Amino acid sequence: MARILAFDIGISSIGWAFSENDELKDCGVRIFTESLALPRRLARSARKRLARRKARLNHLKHLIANEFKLNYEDYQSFDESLAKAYKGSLISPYELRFRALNELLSKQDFARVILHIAKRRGYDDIKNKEKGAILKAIKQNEEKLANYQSVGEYLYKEYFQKFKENSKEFTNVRNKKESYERCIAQSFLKDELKLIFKKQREFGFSFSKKFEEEVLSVAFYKRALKDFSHLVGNCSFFTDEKRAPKNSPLAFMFVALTRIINLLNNLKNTEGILYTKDDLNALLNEVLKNGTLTYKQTKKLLGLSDDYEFKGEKGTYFIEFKKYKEFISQDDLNEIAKDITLIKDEIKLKKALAKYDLNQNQIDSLSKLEFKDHLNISFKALKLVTPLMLEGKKYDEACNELNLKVAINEDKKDFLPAFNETYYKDEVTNPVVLRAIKEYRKVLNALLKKYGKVHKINIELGGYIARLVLNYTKDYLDFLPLSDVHVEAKSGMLTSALRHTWGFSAKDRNNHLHHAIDAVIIAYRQKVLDKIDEIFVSKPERKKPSGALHEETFRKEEEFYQSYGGKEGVLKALELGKIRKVNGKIVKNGDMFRVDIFKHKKTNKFYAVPIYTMDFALKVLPNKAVARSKKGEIKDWILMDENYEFCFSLYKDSLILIQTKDMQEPEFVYYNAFTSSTVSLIVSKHDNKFETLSKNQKILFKNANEKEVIAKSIGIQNLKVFEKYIVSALGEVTKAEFRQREDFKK
RNA sequence: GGAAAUUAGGUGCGCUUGGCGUUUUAGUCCCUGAAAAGGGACUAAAAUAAAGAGUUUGCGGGACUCUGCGGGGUUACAAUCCCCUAAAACCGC
DNA sequence: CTGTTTCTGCCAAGCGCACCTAATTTCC
DNA sequence: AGAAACAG
């Protein structure tokens, strides 16, 4: 009973095979198919950036209304129309900002000047390698800016309502169409608003000193990085302790001792030269004095001029060490470096440093240092290993003397636990990798439930993901005793050579079944192909209701006049959900994650209610089935009243059994989409294999070819059979028991 | 294969911002037309997922903060269930 | 009740964390 | 990737 489970873990597929006594017992393929979190992050950053601009502008509008005795409501929009302070014939802010250098402004003029500069305050050139387009433009604009008093005068005189080359068109002041030519560093716009205040002061404009200070601080405030201390990794030994910052004295001591001790021992392995703690203390004393230890010194402190494993001038290069000591308890010192590493907000860093006995000159000095990066071990481990290494002992000798062992799991389980509950979790942030590991666990645990414990697991695929899955499996899974190494990896170059040897080289390269023949290879002829023909490829139904609520292109309602039937058709489309109106903007739907299938109780005809991401957001469950329309109008949809009974809900990759009147037998297919314009289905064959197509399947998949087996535009209304099924992760097909229609809450 | 370190180049996740683009309401400048009807360039302002939540402190506020297109767990299936997934300051009494 | 085409938001600068890869050192 | 208008 040599029981083996083999897995071909792909980017979007899981092939698995089960062998026992050199006999293939079961086969299957699990198809779970740019970055996942990226669009969510971009939309998140954009929301926060604009929400903060809005509140920043509202804050200035409050200050302007309070200082100038103006109306705050006159700077907000009402009835989706222009704010009252901006109505009528309007002098541009570019002209107002030029006048401010020469004459007194009206307080209505100064109000619009402040708000115009603050809305687009320019790029904060903090850093100042290859320079991108925006960095090129701020430098090119900086050189032109030296001939002008302010940014306002520069834009007003060089571009505002000035005609381009041999044209009757105004050139652009704002940037246009993928060009960044007008980008100007934010510090210059702060200089302009400071100059405008001073010049208006000379011209007789009266305002409290607190007003200008508040306006400047509010308009140009920028938050530091949000607290990220939770994202720091943990120690290899003490998993409950955070990693130590690299720029702490202990870490400097540990790293310096690591290079020095290892170099002295390296010379023993190479030249048999035995050095002492004194020869160690000499090299360490040179590090502790300047944080530096060039190779030229070290060789002179112990021999000739030699080339041992080299690169550059410095052997030890603690760049930030000298700055740390120049800016100034051992535990408080390491705790200070941690605060400098983590608290990027200088004011919050000033407050954190203030809890320690240090003068104001030291606190301001320590607040300016930039620390980053961490070791892989904690301060707790450094407090133990470093004293022994100070005595000249290597890292491994110190760990063995202290009985320090790397943390590893001891309680192995029958089933593989959630990857989130292992100490390998913090190593993986990529949702793509987390996805593949999840589907590996689900398939493995399903096999364990079906057949029981196994002796061995073989794995093959970025090959580090295989080493990760392997270490994760042998650290946490309990295997059958093979005696009185249970997890192994198969060489990819070897498995590819077996594919050519066993004739499988080009068997089913175009369909989903070839992931299983690879797993059959990982575990180790015509009997093998017999098992492959029995596979039903498993795909999970996609029930996620979240996503973009609508397309991102805002459209005019006139775009739909021809297709929907003018204004009357647009209002009808809005009432049916064929289009949405968000913030007064017409937008198309997002994903149709669900469709609810109904059946007329007396005619037996089927009807479909499409359900979109916006509908879930509204928490309103639609109840009207699509009806086909004439060419240029929208027919009434059909209310699902007591004449229609809910059958089931379909999601992408739901398994269904369908049969048309022209089909002699029903067929299991995967539901892919419901097309609302034609009230029809798109379905696909489980394995996407064109060569095994039966006579009955050719009726349904009349347009199939060697690359895809997909049937589009299949009408649902007169289907003879339309039933929902459920696929397990191993390819088992079960009839879907009736479940009542799932509602939206609140 | 495993523990530690160094240098360099990448990937992902996260955060702080900038500039567009679009829709809307107007304006500046120019253009065809008898009028109708418009057209183009440019400028400003508002909006930029629907919509919600919350302590610090007893209550309230936004001139506060956060959630809102991701992943994991659960299982005839994977979801709207569960977890990753909050916490301060300031103003007023 | 089928068959086919159309249309979809985007880039830039910088700072953090977790990893990967390629070399190099001490070790098991 | 996937909604849905256009087309037959």
Curated annotation (Swiss-Prot):
The simplicity of the Cas9-gRNAs RNA-directed DNA endonuclease activity may be used to target and modify a DNA sequence of interest. Keywords: Antiviral defense, DNA-binding, Endonuclease, Hydrolase, Magnesium, Manganese, Metal-binding, Nuclease, RNA-binding. Mg(2+) 1 binds at D8, E460. The active site is at D8 (for ruvc-like nuclease domain). Its cofactor is Mg(2+). GO terms for molecular function: DNA binding; endonuclease activity; metal ion binding; RNA binding. Has 2 endonuclease domains. The discontinuous RuvC-like domain cleaves the target DNA noncomplementary to crRNA while the HNH nuclease domain cleaves the target DNA complementary to crRNA. Belongs to the CRISPR-associated protein Cas9 family. Subtype II-C subfamily. CRISPR (clustered regularly interspaced short palindromic repeat) is an adaptive immune system that provides protection against mobile genetic elements (viruses, transposable elements and conjugative plasmids). CRISPR clusters contain spacers, sequences complementary to antecedent mobile elements, and target invading nucleic acids. CRISPR clusters are transcribed and processed into CRISPR RNA (crRNA). In type II CRISPR systems correct processing of pre-crRNA requires a trans-encoded small RNA (tracrRNA), endogenous ribonuclease 3 (rnc) and this protein. This is CRISPR-associated endonuclease Cas9. It comes from Campylobacter jejuni subsp. jejuni serotype O:2 (strain ATCC 700819 / NCTC 11168). The gene is cas9.
